């Protein structure tokens, strides 16, 4: 017996934002809502009214002129719900159309040259956490029982937000993610530990909402804001660019 | 309250298969079936009439002249039932009398040298799984609560397997197998990872029938088919040295 | 819902050792529990008569004429009920009034120099058991959502158990601790997998302890008997210096 | 935590039915859906799309040109998820602005005076499953702590009933009804004890959606069809009243 | 595995009332609260620091000079907590050192000549809800496997209420209670159901206190106010004739 | 999903009784398991040998020559695993090849003029306990949805019953059983309530074995001895008119 959540969320949806088809979803994180106040035509959905939403909102609308969805506020594995969390709400986007997750999440530096205010575009990542979203029963209706995480960080968009990145002016680096369960912060051995296993930045989610989106076939773009404006202008110079 | 799971089994079996006293227990994994087929007096039951066994059957007969148990089919951690799994079907390869476990598995290669169609016998491994199977109360009636690890893929075996080998005329590399959770495959940096940690395969079981053989003392053997004939000959030329 | 468990035993407590306020907390490890009986006016409690206690009992009284109260058993993620087993435990502690918990354990050593009978002060660790104590709802009462394990192991208290060390004639070495899920021991494998992570030292429990202890605000110090009366020395004399 | 289940459905129903407010709501037991093929712009949602309602389809629209919910399969105690599964979709009945449940189900005759073929207006009932449907913690949202089953059986549509049927020619005898937990039949002696007790009519449903029904201030009219077109009359005509 | 929650609150209640030995255990129902306000040196526990007491405060003290426990408050079946909700509590009482539980409660008469404002001695009880409290395995601690309800409304106590009740000018009908689960009231017919099995009273409650008491051989005394200062007085008078 | 544990017992049973389909099956209450003792070429499998049955032995053999299977010992709905307890094990009876059940037990008279010591063959039954064996979703595999409890209490045998009373001079009383949870006893109005509903005799069991019985078609026989050698030749006899 699977989730059905997914397919009553659609008919919700219809009710508050009819005859629309988003093309992009954002996953706004920490400090990040502030961006969704400049949704054209925007409508707000309590996650209250969605099943299968980590309740603590989730607005629609236009940005730069393409259709999008927002979720401001997410859902993390310390929360006790282990690391299916994300992944009904991730499946409402792929039936509602989308063709891109951008995940968008605070985060740590696991290296000196990168330091608080940066942002870094993930190329891959290295779970952390116990298991993973998929593990149980397999729901045929959204993908197969083994699927590849190669490319899982779309190469393509990922050039795209380099290129956006130069035409600002501001760096944008790019690197490995590492999950951490949390709620605690990492310890400095922990860090050591994940510096020595190839990692660049350290976070408490991410992993999740993409391997979720991978199982589904939607495609994925991520940026972390490194913690301990541009934002931004990244991503609405890479909507303007997708259009 | 323990499992008596493995108790029932043996009266079942009896019934399918009387006066029969296994020696060597195998569990063939993805393509291997086809190995089964060549069991002298060969008596299949169904998994669904052994209580504890992995639902998706187990085949009593001889092979080489050796009286053999073989597993088409085994259970992983991804399916949901935690590390626990293959604990019972294990216990029942011991209460029969088997003195090793045979265990293959389909898997992935993290060395370049090492690629596809390879067989790599395991020498040791490095558990990547949330916990183990002995997590628990332990049943007294299996083997004790802490347990060794060392030599637990059978230097012996291991060495009767590499003049094998060289009998038939294939390389049979030894690695370090390391156990990922899955469904999902790994990640291009989980896989660097597994590299710079020492891990030489990489696969989604194994480790939870081997941990569980251990404990009960029940030797094992275990050989990777890397999957990005020989296997026949070397399993048969193994039971030959053994008889 | 939370649990109430620690306010429990500040009542029950209370009834077998009136107006009494400890200020240093241990938790007595395998082997270690021949110091509790010299323990000044010793009163035992069998962990039974405490709820949320990891029944396998608790001695309150003066040590070095310091107010103590003495875990003799501790509770293991190995022994199935998660990683929250000795959280009320320790916020038993911090509710007593204790300023520090001083954690013993016996361990495995990731150093060749450092050897069967050496003592290991803890200057920090790298958690490999699954999740960690704090995941589900955060208890208000105790400590906040998120929080620091910088300093977890107490530098201050650390520089005095090196003081200590020297006064009595032994070598104090400090490492960082690593633990593992078990019940079953670390393959070599795993390690070697340890080594090249950073870790000095490897066991079963600890960091369970400490993240809860640093949670609720607990200062904690802890020390590895490595096992693969000098220990009382050092347990007395820091005694002796915090009076 | 309360079930959202019927706020959901208000939602969902929007989509399918919007600008709808109907005022009577219908269960059409066994035997009795041929009636909701007569229903004017008629909609039919499947119960799988409907979150809280008893999965084995709902039709909305107009009947006697009166604005109809019509429940076509119901849920039973039997199916042993407790005796709530009828109060989420009785929920949503009221939550939709209808006025009067209208509850029908197929039963059996504790009189010889009335046999199969007759219909009984149900005046009152006997509840012999075990606990009811409220048990545990009271949903303010719905109703309140305690509530009266005083007029259960609303008695002004009860006497608009016994004109109905005099205007068309048949019987419309008045019962207690004594639910019966089921799925077996009721033995002789448990049917002598029911006449005893001073049952009319015995059945395995009504009880639950009644009272829930009451909780949350729902008027009722329930009438059962002996089985051991006077319905469709006695419905049809019921409307035309209280239009 | 049994409750030790008995246990732990004599521990507990010895620190807010030590060296106390109650006869009398009181559970005061709905409006009858007032009563505890006149007991002698009055301590009162919230149920919130006693395991195992009903959650909606506990008094402890002397009243017409005897050693009395009070209950000011009381779980019932229809909380959703099952038969067992009062039984931790009764077991504290007799643990205690209690010699009669005295029971009182609001309830409705099944008798004309009996009304409003009439107090009722129970003599039986009839049990509605379904199962009872001691379903389970059974805790030898407190009593026996099977155990016989004969007089279980003590006759003895019964006879000095009787003259109490003379004793002060009002009168003292007794009477059969039988047990409603609620929180629904009952409908009529239930009611009819309840005259002709042979009730005299009708509550939500007593039977599981009641049962529970009996089981660890705490005698008992019940009287039920009906509601569809004599109270006072003939809980004053009785403790005056046992004194 | 459902039990195959009946499927598991008959191989089971099968390596301890070969070759062998009993015709009747019995179920020896409290002091009747000394009649077992006389079956012919006795095998005793313990209930722990056979998953599904009733864990406080079965005995297979022939008993005036007729092949039979015998319970010493079954479950209640007292014990906590609800009215389910029972259901395996006939199911069971029915695999093995049986065509009726013998039902027996320990009871209590509801008559005067039937006391301690009588026999009383039970015609028919009214259920006291909360729910039936059948709630929940229904296995095809044994039987339908709904059934009939029409001559559960077959009315061909008890006539055959009736003439061996006859034949050996002992009365043999029918009457209707009533069903209580337990495991207390009843009360006194509990009795007379039971009485005026219509019983005959009063227990804590059958009712779950002989619904059970019905649904998978399985004719049933009980005969309860009143408790508050004529069993045997009762038996014996009526084993002796069928064979
Ligand atoms: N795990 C983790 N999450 C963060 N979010 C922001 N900063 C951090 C950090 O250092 N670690
Ligand atoms: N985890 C894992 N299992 C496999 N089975 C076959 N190939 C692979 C691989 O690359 N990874
Ligand atoms: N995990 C673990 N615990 C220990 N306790 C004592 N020695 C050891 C060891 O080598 N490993
Ligand atoms: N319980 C019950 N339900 C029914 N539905 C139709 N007839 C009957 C009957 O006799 N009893
Ligand atoms: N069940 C029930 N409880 C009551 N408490 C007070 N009055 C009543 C009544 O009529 N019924
Ligand atoms: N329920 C019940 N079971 C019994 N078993 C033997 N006697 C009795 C009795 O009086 N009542």
Chains 1, 2, 3, 4, 5, 6 share one sequence.
Request: proline fraction near 5%; hydrophobic fraction near 45%.
């Amino acid at each position: 017996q699977f989730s059905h959540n997914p397919l009553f969320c659609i008919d919700i949806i219809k009710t508050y934002k009819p005859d629309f088809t988003p093309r992009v979803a954002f996953i706004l994180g920490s400090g990040l809502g502030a961006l969704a106040d400049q949704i054209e035509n925007a409508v707000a959905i309590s996650y209250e009214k969605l099943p299968g939403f980590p309740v603590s909102e989730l607005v629609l609308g236009h940005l730069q002129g393409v259709p999008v969805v927002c979720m401001k506020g997410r859902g993390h594995f310390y929360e006790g719900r282990g690391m299916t969390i994300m992944t009904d709400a991730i499946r409402t986007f792929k039936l509602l159309g989308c063709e891109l997750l951008f995940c968008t999440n605070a985060a740590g530096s696991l290296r000196p040259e990168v330091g608080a205010g940066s942002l870094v575009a993930l190329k891959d990542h290295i779970n952390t956490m116990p298991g993973t979203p998929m593990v149980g029963l397999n729901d045929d209706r959204f993908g197969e029982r083994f699927f590849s995480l190669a490319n899982a960080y779309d190469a393509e968009y990922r050039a795209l937000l380099q290129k956006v990145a130069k035409e600002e002016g501001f760096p944008l680096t790019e690197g490995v993610f590492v999950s951490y369960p949390g709620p605690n912060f990492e310890t400095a051995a922990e860090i050591r530990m994940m510096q020595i296993i190839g990692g660049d930045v350290v976070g408490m989610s991410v992993v999740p909402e993409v391997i979720s989106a991978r199982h589904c076939d939607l495609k994925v773009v991520a940026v972390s804001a490194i913690t301990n404006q541009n934002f931004i202008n990244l991503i609405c110079g890479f909507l303007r660019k997708i259009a």
